[PDB]
From a paper:
TatD is a conserved protein widely expressed in different species, including bacteria, fungi, plants and animals. TatD represents the first example of a TIM-barrel exonuclease that hydrolyzes the phosphodiester bond at the 3′ end of a nucleic acid chain. TatD has a TIM-barrel fold and it trims DNA from 3′-to-5′ ends in the hydrogen peroxide-induced DNA repair, including double-strand break repair and nucleotide excision repair in E. coli.
To understand how TatD binds and cleaves DNA, we further co-crystallized TatD with a single-stranded DNA (5′-GCTTAGCT-3′). TatD–DNA complex was crystallized by the hanging-drop vapor diffusion method and the co-crystal diffracted X-ray to a resolution of 2.9 Å. The simulated annealing omit Fourier map (2Fo − Fc) of the bound DNA revealed weak electron density for the three nucleotides (5′-G-p-C-p-T-3′). The 8-nucleotide single-stranded DNA was likely digested by TatD and resulted a 3-nucleotide DNA. Alternatively, it is possible that the 5′ end of the DNA was disordered and only the three nucleotides at the 3′ end were observed. The DNA was refined with an occupancy of 0.7 and an averaged B-factor of 69.2 Å2 and was bound at the loop region on the top of the TIM-barrel in a way similar to that of Endo IV. Superimposition of the apo-form and DNA-bound TatD gave an average RMSD of 0.394 Å for 259 Cα atoms, suggesting that DNA binding did not induce any major conformational change. Moreover, the residue H64 near the scissile phosphate had two alternative conformations and was refined with an occupancy of 0.53 (apo-form conformation) and 0.47 (flip-out conformation), respectively. However, no metal ion was identified in the TatD–DNA complex structure and DNA is bound loosely between two TatD molecules in the crystal, indicating that the 5′-G-p-C-p-T-3′ was bound in an inactive conformation.
Author numbering: 1 to 260
The structure:
Amino acid sequence: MFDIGVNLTSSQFAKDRDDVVACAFDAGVNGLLITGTNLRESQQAQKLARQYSSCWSTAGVHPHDSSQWQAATEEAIIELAAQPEVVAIGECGLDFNRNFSTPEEQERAFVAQLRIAADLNMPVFMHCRDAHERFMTLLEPWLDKLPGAVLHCFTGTREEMQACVAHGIYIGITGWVCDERRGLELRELLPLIPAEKLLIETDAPYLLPRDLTPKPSSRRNEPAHLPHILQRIAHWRGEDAAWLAATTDANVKTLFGIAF
């Protein structure tokens, strides 16, 4: 199994980042994709990717930080992407559920990073919340020039899922599906996701699975909870956890071009 959603730069892991990484590996996790959310966090993720074996990173600007985008920013992401630890351009995309950055500059910073991925021939680590239609319009002229793409932390509908998959977009599934409150719609579309478009992640330190027993006092998510998520996903697909692990790991290698 592989975790494509680890925000390891987070200050929540500051006290025990080594132990966090080590424990995940001791649970069956075969690799980590350390998420970069802005220029500064992308540079830190590249440093952590050298620090640990079987760890890579993404370089990009989150739609939440899309207001930070300048002309000096592009080349800065490229100096970082040149590293053999950086395998994806992201996290980038649209987030209209919030207002942290104006949708004008969200869109601008999204297309800019999409152009970068086309220039360097790299896959993208995408983010989309309540912005599906505007998402596919901006992706439309760029996607055919990219190796691949992933809609990580997908929370949309099954129609939206089939809309993305039709264009070769990998669907990322977190422990959001483990929430009884607001994970009903997701769990029912899970068997419809083509197994070779499925990717598993934790989005640590967020989206700690609610069906965990017992619950950690801290309630901080970590990549050591990935096997739990795969098992639930496999069960809700009527699959063997070992089989889906071998498939989801192939998808990681196919999309990112890494080995573990």
